[PDB]
């Protein structure tokens, strides 16, 4: 959310908001340079090659294996300049979010979002789920283990293959139990995607489709609404899918997106999910919750130094929105939670957003982006939290001019086209 004060990656390591930190996670990774931009949130402006074994490194595919939306170059991000100018490039998108009265409500909801104490094997015992906090670097060389809601990481070796990952349990799902996990979106701010459109009225298109860029701000708050779901767990099986056309038959092929999209995306493109699917899975998120509401109730004790019992009950009780009758007990606001329910699913969409950003972005999450531009969003001149790439008081205000990449072309430097044309990407 709001960052109160001004980070230099240069900035000296204080233990608290500023520290050397380890991923919870699985090898014997050397530490990173952090930052903590606000409670719970975390930016590490460093390339991903800490959330998955698989992806060690930064090596590219063979050309003739890689995704035709994609972008590689081991060296992006890997000096203290470019690091800086992630941080602060990641930092103004927040603010430019949190400008927005969508945006604060999305953030609130995010740093409230506390994942549950569910990982002991006693069943009246609240314990932290070791994968759902980071281990901070003590002046001493020892780790102090720390919770956390949200990291905000650099991409890994495809560059803007963009994500909200997280760390799973033995046995929980944790994104799909209400429990809620630690999210880390892979992220950039220093590329966007370029796309054709042109909003017309009858007949017209002698120039052909405007080409231009989408705002990063769009982008992350996309990857943030999978965490808000996430931290809530209430997140749905990506295998669950809708048929999204008319002129093809399923099986889950010609055109299937997942629900978990439809619904992120929201708009004219939630109109494909089924009603009922729909209504299922708001009352089955809603007994998960009620289970939750009972662990609490008959919680007896709790793992830890600081934190008290009735501290984290007290905790949980705000997250989950629970009423605590006249005895003690805890139950599930229905008001509370349909409202809290509809604004985590529904309210906060990539559309919503969209609206309140007043920026030109995909019309159906069904588009087609044609190229990646190298964009700098850390000058104030280039963009600003109120108005993004369409400068107010410049011939950049109107008309999306500021996204058009043929007009603002300087602030849009071409990488890639995406030579293919027919598929996805995602998100
Ligand atoms: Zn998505």
Known sequence: PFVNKQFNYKDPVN???????????????????????????????????????????????????????????????????????????????????????????????????????????????????????????????????????????????????????????????????????????RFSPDFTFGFEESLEVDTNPLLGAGKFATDPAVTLAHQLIHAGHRLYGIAINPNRVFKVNTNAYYEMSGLEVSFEELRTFGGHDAKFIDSLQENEFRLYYYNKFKDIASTLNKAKSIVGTTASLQYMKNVFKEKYLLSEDTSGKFSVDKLKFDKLYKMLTEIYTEDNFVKFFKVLNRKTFLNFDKAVFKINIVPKVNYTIYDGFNLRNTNLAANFNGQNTEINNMNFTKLKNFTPGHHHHHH
């Not at 409500?105 to 932290?128: A, H, N, Y």
Request: net charge negative; hydrophobic share 35%; with cysteine.
């Open 15 to 185: 233990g608290v908001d500023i520290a050397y930190i380890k991923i919870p996670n699985a090898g014997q990774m050397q530490p990173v340079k952090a930052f903590k931009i606000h409670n719970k949130i975390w930016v590490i402006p460093e390339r991903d090659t800490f959330t998955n074994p698989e992806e060690g490194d930064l090596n590219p595919p063979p050309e003739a294996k890689q995704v035709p939306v994609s972008y590689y170059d081991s060296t992006y991000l890997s000096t203290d300049n470019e690091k800086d100018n992630y941080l602060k490039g990641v930092t103004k998108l927040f603010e430019r979010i949190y400008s927005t009265d969508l945006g604060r409500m999305l953030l609130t909801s995010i740093v409230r979002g506390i994942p549950f104490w569910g990982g002991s094997t006693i069943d009246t015992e609240l314990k932290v789920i070791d994968t759902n906090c980071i281990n901070v670097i003590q002046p001493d060389g020892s780790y102090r283990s720390e919770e956390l809601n949200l990291v905000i990481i650099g991409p890994s070796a495809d560059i803007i293959q963009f994500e909200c990952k997280s760390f799973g349990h033995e046995v929980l799902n944790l994104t799909r139990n209400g429990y809620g996990s630690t999210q880390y979106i």
